[PDB]
Symmetry: C2
Subunit: 213 residues, 2 copies
């Protein structure tokens, strides 16, 4: 049997609802009056009534904005019943797919990441890793594509930029010489993760680095 | 059989082509690999290739902007063929409907309309009618809803506004007293027709009125 494998709808649509999706009918409507209905989660099962079909015209519609991160795909079936009460078609599968918008900020997996480094470590020495996740669609968009940056370093001594971060991996490394346990044993870095390859929604966390012998 | 009775597409779409319309598949694709194709005017018949279907995925797409005033409805059929060469579904009817944009200016049915009026006619006397048409969708929009106005009167004597026009019907009537064949035997009015109930696209024509005894 034929299936409508996808009718796409972006999440978070604005403007007037309901919105038309597609009109389906039985070509047996030349024989009898036919009445249309739909079943499935999103139709008669929870979330009830997100999708409706006009009983006489067969216009399938969506009645509220969708949310890809809650339900990304709805599987419905359309039904066609004559006025005398006989189903005149085998029910047809109709799938609604929800496309992504950038509506989730990245989140670091920890509020505070801890790491340590030997004071004599040569510039370039990898110290620790910070990590973030993003609930948006990393398959089809850059809405979940995170760039890591360092926002600040406390203290700014002996130099303001003792460390750097790999923009893609979140690995933090020694950038310059001068680390010294006896002068400054601890650094607090504010790190940022931002989606849209660093241009989008952002969040911060801390990396606390202990300088060892 | 089920029919996709309408997938709507506005005419004159901008941005990137091709544009996805709907994805259709055979659920017999669990048994065999299935290849999809479409037939109909707009697909394999003229205008060829305005609609295409991806042979493996079943994504039906439109490849160029549509024009409601040229073709307002396309009737396509989808086909599903196994890799061994057997049609695995009855072809399904899929109708694409083109929705309207206001892209046609009203047009008067004549460049010059002629009428006459007796000089003693009381104010309110109907003189003649001007008429315009509009190729846009008068059923579903106001894109063809015309308001008539008078733009100018030559000569502006004895008064600047000797006539008026019914905004809906285009009937021109005597507005005030003072018409006189021996003083001014002829008036040329520039008349305007504008769609969007007078707010939209506009055109002009002339109404030449002869004053009789
Ligand atoms: Ca969402
Ligand atoms: Ca995001
Ligand atoms: Ca999202
Ligand atoms: Ca047009
Ligand atoms: Ca128009
Ligand atoms: Ca039009």
């Amino acid at each position: 049997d034929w299936v409508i494998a996808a009718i796409s709808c972006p999440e978070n649509e604005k403007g007037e609802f309901p919105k038309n999706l597609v009109q389906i009918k039985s070509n047996r409507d030349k024989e009898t009056k036919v009445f249309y209905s739909i079943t499935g989660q999103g139709a008669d099962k929870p979330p009830v009534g997100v999708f409706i079909i006009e009983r006489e015209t067969g216009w399938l519609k969506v009645t509220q904005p969708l949310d890809r991160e809650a339900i990304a795909k709805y599987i419905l079936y359309s039904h066609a019943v004559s006025s005398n009460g006989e189903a005149v078609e085998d029910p047809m599968e109709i799938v609604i797919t929800v496309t992504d918008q950038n509506d989730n900020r990245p989140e670091f997996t920890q509020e505070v990441f801890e790491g340590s480094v030997a004071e004599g470590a040569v510039p370039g020495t990898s110290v620790m890793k910070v990590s973030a996740t993003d609930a948006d669609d990393d398959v089809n968009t850059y809405n979940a594509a995170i760039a890591y940056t360092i926002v600040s370093q406390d203290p700014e001594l002996p130099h303001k930029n003792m460390f750097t971060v790999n923009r893609d991996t979140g690995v933090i490394s020694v950038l310059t010489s001068g680390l010294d346990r006896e002068s400054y044993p601890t650094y607090t870095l504010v790190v940022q993760a931002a989606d849209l390859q660093g241009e989008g929604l952002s969040t911060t966390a801390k990396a606390v680095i202990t300088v060892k012998d």
